[PDB]
Amino acid sequence: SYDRAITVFSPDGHLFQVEYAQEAVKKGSTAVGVRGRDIVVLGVEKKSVAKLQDERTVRKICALDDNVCMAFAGLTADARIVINRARVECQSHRLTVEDPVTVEYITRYIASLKQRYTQSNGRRPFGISALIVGFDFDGTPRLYQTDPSGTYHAWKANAIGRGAKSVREFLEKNYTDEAIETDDLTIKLVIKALLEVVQSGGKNIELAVMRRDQSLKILNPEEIEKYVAEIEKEKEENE
Amino acid sequence: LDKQIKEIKEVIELPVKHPELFEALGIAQPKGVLLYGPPGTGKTLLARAVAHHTDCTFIRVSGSELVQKFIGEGARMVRELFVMAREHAPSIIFMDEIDGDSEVQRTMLELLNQLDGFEATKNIKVIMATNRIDILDSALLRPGRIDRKIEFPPPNEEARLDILKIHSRKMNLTRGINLRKIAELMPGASG
Amino acid sequence: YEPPVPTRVGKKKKKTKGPDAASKLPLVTPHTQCRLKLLKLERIKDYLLMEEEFIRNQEQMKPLEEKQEEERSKVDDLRGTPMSVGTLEEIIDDNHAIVSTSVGSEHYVSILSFVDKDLLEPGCSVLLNHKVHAVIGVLMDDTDPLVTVMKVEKAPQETYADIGGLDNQIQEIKESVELPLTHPEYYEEMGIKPPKGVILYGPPGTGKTLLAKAVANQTSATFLRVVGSELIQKYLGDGPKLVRELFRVAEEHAPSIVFIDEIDAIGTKRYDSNSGGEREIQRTMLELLNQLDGFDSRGDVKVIMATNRIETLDPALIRPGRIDRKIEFPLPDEKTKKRIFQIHTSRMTLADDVTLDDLIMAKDDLSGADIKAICTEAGLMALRERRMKVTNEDFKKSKENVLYK
Amino acid sequence: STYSRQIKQVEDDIQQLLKKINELTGIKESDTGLAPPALWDLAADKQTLQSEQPLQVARCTKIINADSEDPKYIINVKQFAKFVVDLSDQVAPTDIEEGMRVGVDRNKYQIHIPLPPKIDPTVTMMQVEEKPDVTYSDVGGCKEQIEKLREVVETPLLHPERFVNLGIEPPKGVLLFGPPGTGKTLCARAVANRTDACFIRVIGSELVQKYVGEGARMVRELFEMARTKKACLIFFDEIDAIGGARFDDGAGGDNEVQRTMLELINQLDGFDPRGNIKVLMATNRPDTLDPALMRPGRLDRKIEFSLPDLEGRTHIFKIHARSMSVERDIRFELLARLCPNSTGAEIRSVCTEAGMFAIRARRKIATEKDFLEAVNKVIKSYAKFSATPRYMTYN
Amino acid sequence: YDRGVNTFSPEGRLFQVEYAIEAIKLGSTAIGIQTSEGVCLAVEKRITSPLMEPSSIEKIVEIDAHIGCAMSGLIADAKTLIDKARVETQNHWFTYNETMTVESVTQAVSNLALQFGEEDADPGAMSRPFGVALLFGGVDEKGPQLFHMDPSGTFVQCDARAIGSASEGAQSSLQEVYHKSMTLKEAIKSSLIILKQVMEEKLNATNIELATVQPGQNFHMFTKEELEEVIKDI
Ligand SMILES: Nc1ncnc2c1ncn2[C@@H]1O[C@H](COP(=O)(O)OP(=O)(O)OP(=O)(O)O)[C@@H](O)[C@H]1O
Ligand SMILES: Nc1ncnc2c1ncn2[C@@H]1O[C@H](COP(=O)(O)OP(=O)(O)OP(=O)(O)O)[C@@H](O)[C@H]1O
Ligand SMILES: Nc1ncnc2c1ncn2[C@@H]1O[C@H](COP(=O)(O)OP(=O)(O)O)[C@@H](O)[C@H]1O
């Protein structure tokens, strides 16, 4: 067996393998998640849309369970392992406690799984960051973000990927109680956040939504194009 | 090499003789040419021919330390030859890679970088002759560095006959030599 | 016997070079055409009238031997002809020095009064009398062939307007090489010296050399361009010697901007002509460490470095104090790609069926060099077909040439 | 504007006057290295050209019959010839020794004046003649380091009386080592500014030369010229260029450079006493230095320039933010806490970048937010290129 | 690199242990004070964005009803140490039907530190030290007790210990304010005073955590209303 310390402390006290894994996240597609009142929203930039690419197979928004889904940013191959590992534990938790997994628990397990790979012999850290969204058993919307180090935090709205810093700056200024008053307004906030880094427009936006007591719903391109027209229309009257 | 002659003409002859064609077209004048093919295919033959026909001074940069006294007493950097190149503009600077890292390809980068936008005098073209194009550095293969890459495939049956006709003219030939058969008897041969 | 004791402190020449000499007229303030400037200028004029009258009176009763044209005519007689060119080896005294002729023979000669004693340093070229070898002048060394090569005589035609999408990159480079020279007051009022060094790093073709070309276009300082591969020399020590000499020329032509393009090529490329292996390159690197930030005080010399492989550089080379700013040059996005295409097709004569939007997605990893090469080759296709209008087919065949094959 | 006409009239008259003044005064030209005519003692120069005859530089080789009253001197006149000559009547017999340079005439080649030993012009320029503008007050967080450096390289020269009385032989060498930007050369520049003895700056890359035996030769002439002075200081910046440890890699790997280090080691502590030279070595890679060079008697003191602590980083922040137009309530203690392991060079960049965020915003005063953004840009954003993580292993 | 994890410096220092100690200086500042009336634990959340929920940043962890832990450095690494502490506790209760002493709990977690190796180690063995300093605080037979743990596995009882980024500054202030015979309210107030002076942000009831373990009472997480009561003074 390969038993070698891949992740070791730098003399300054940094785990460089963790930091390098976080750099791979910054090279991934921008994923934006906004937690509303009665709906949770995940928006993922589709990078480059080749007309010969089956959009069904390449999907950065995946459902761990009937009430929890996450969008990632980083190495696509690494994320799928985390998603499958979380999906297996989603069913293990359900068979044991006879209750669907809370958004904290699946975020905690994924983060703990990430940290284990930063302190185990022969394993490099996972180079992906996850935007976990869902609803608890009491109906409270919850949005969580994990990073390759293994730390997890709850966010009202957050962005991961190449344009995370600009979008999070945008989300800091526009995320208000009024902006999440209705489901449509919550959807428009993600598109406004995504359009700050997405250049062409709604063609490179993949938006998926989850409502309380409902499964994850992927928005069709026409629905997204319908929303983009509304922001474009609303831009004129504000000028 | 009729195709190769036309390709090198639009890149080395047209910018020198007619700079207005490129200005009207709105494109930068070519400055770097790469002739690649098997040895003995005529890369140096064509590069010398263009310099002879466009009245461009032909400078061969082999990196030899024997000719270093003529380039300059400094000899610290290869761009010191540009002083002699500017004095004889239009000039064609030719390096042939015989084939550590290649010094001819290294000299390409130093000359091409100067010719990019840091050279005031125009009509200073540069040529490299190489055996293979997949061994080149990624810096040379980067678009915008070499303005045109010209291939010199080994002569086919008809091209070998043309080469055979050219060189046999320098001999006392009996009438009726079937040079076509002799060309057929040399498959996969160079010039 | 006792050794002679020099009265001059040190053995080096005066640091000041190329001054106004006796014409160092004072900076009369303000420049506005008012009375006190007229009053100030009159005082300068008055003392000149006093100076003119006094000097004329002395020379009027000066002996015929002692005249301004006679003494200069005499000076040639003491110098004689020819004037042998030697090398200053050591300054024994104020009027005594050891010089060596071109034949390698040293002579202990006397330095005459009319020689500029402040220009005398060991290793300098001196003019010696043919007979007595006495120092009778200092030959202003002509510009070295190495000096001419670094110096960019004519500013490149590429301006900041010809750069598309690098708004932040352009802004950062200005505060370190342009703003300190054009507007030094901003730094002085803030109490900070300008950012010392700058390095431009990113994928190939992203515009690193182009921004330096834009910098060289709009600069009043001397621009010296050196490729990193030029610092690899054929003999031991000449690598460090060339780096030492490159920054000496920068100090002479102060203020100056030194552009060490392709800095990573000093280590990422190994050549058999370089006698010492990686060890000689390391010594060259250490010499460059001293020049960027070392013991010697640095004048108004700004250093710009460019590299597509910044991970291969010695971290001590690009440390703060040596290279303060590390400007990244990312691959162009959709907005920048359209700007680059419009930049390189502005002088073109495009056809109505040519759309730049389709050419934007020619490749996912499209750089500015690829865009310019696509356009340049596309025009070459039109030149082959004897046309001035570039069609979509010309651009279509352009992509399959530069991007593929 | 009413004086624009009168300005140009007096400006043109002035410009005509300097051109007129320079006509009689002279001083036009200088390309042949001509001094201004106010310094022309042509009467003395004509006498100098006749009374003072030129002298050829020669080296004495052997003194024959020095005991007797007819001592013959064999001289080597560079590339000219070799002659057996006698001393002039104006020079004492005891003033010329074997192996020393002398001045000889062109007629009988009799030795006329003893001369200083030949020294490479490159080595001569290696001595510092303009002191740097850095004082010990410009170095923060290096208190204990600075006292140790001064008490070896500054105190014995300044106050030698307190060492001879107690029979004390002070250390004659200090090695400054630490990660880049920690202040090794900055402290050396402070030493040169304060020192009154001769200071020679040597860069290890300057001792690497094309031919075989040059680096050792330049070291020999370096200490030979240093010994011609009562007290001297030699600074070896980046000693690791030539100070690497000796090794045998089959081929001649670094054999020539090792000889340069061996010669330097011989001068520091060999058969002959070094003299009154106190050497100062600075390197960021002390692990590569030869064990014999890292030995007391050659490098007696090993002053380590480690990364500054919280108190030290606060001190460096005050030094570099002394002339800044900062706000009233800049929390420099907080800023020092935001960069745990950061060199003094990074702190200087943080101060410079902090004023850059304010200059960008067209603000004449830098707020605390600018320093906060400066730390993020320098300490955090530029941490990818940081030399600290790799160089703490070497030190 | 060439160096292994279990390598000794020429000065006798374990390289990876010292490097993990430097990681604490990058973490948030945590203050723990031992008082005869109880042990107070304070820590700064270090909010980096308004959108992040401060409630999610749990830097004070209930080890048991009678012992709590404050963490600084790498928060992700402390989860393994905390889980073992919460497992070692309730294992002493399972076998001895009593609450484990705070010293024993810290000792058990300390043994986890330094159990890292490259070769000749179990597949589940760790590769690097835990770059987190813990501040265990609770009540036992010996009354209230505060213990400080470091990535070196060295645990020691401390009357008032401050760990984190401002450990040097807060410890000096702690010595100027700590006396053996004071009340817990003063200990809570003094910790908030020291924290407020060292935080980058402005101290309020949402960017800090305060925990007290009093005799008789259990481990208690200070709420926003309780935090506002003591912050309103200073
Ligand atoms: N952002 C840009 N805007 C406009 N033109 C650009 C841009 N980037 C590149 N170019 C064009 O590309 C040409 C070649 O690229 P350039 O020489 O600047 O590359 P570089 O980024 O320095 O890379 P390298 O030296 O690694 O190949 C330039 O002459 C310029 O016209
Ligand atoms: N202790 C310090 N106090 C104040 N300023 C400092 C200190 N240390 C470094 N600096 C600043 O950082 C700069 C770094 O240059 P310096 O010559 O000190 O580096 P160094 O230690 O010799 O590095 P290198 O190993 O790369 O040669 C100095 O010019 C100075 O402005
Ligand atoms: N296509 C050709 N036609 C006529 N002669 C040729 C041709 N190719 C090569 N030669 C002959 O070969 C000789 C050397 O070829 P050269 O051009 O040096 O080869 P390379 O192209 O490898 O440099 C020339 O003297 C030339 O006469």
Ligand SMILES: [Mg+2]
């Ligand atoms: Mg050939």
Ligand SMILES: [Mg+2]
């Ligand atoms: Mg370039």
Ligand SMILES: [Mg+2]
């Ligand atoms: Mg230094």
